[PDB]
Amino acid sequence: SMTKTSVDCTMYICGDSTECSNLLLQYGSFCTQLKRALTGIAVEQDKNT
């Protein structure tokens, strides 16, 4: 297994900035894909062990 990581878009791409929240929402569901992929990887690591 590897390190069981997870990422928050709304904090990574911008931090205290709230304008980036609105600017990112219009980008679409890339971050839902990212969170689903990373959660799948994490559950996969648990299953591996």
């Binding site: 997870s6 928050d8 709304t10 904090m11 969170k35 959660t39």
Partner: protein, 48 residues
């Protein structure tokens, strides 16, 4: 309530047994503090 957030993030009115990541907890700064060097070497205005 958290269960309704789970329902919305799963887009299903029935959620199966498990753990689902719904939102992101975040703590925002309560106060704002500004600090600068304490020593103030008073220029000789009083002297003149």
């Amino acid at each position: 309530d958290p269960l309704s957030e789970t329902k919305c993030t799963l887009k299903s009115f029935t959620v199966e047994k498990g753990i689902y990541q719904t939102s992101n907890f975040r703590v925002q700064p309560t106060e704002s503090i500004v600090r600068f060097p304490n020593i103030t070497n008073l220029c000789p205005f009083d002297e003149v």
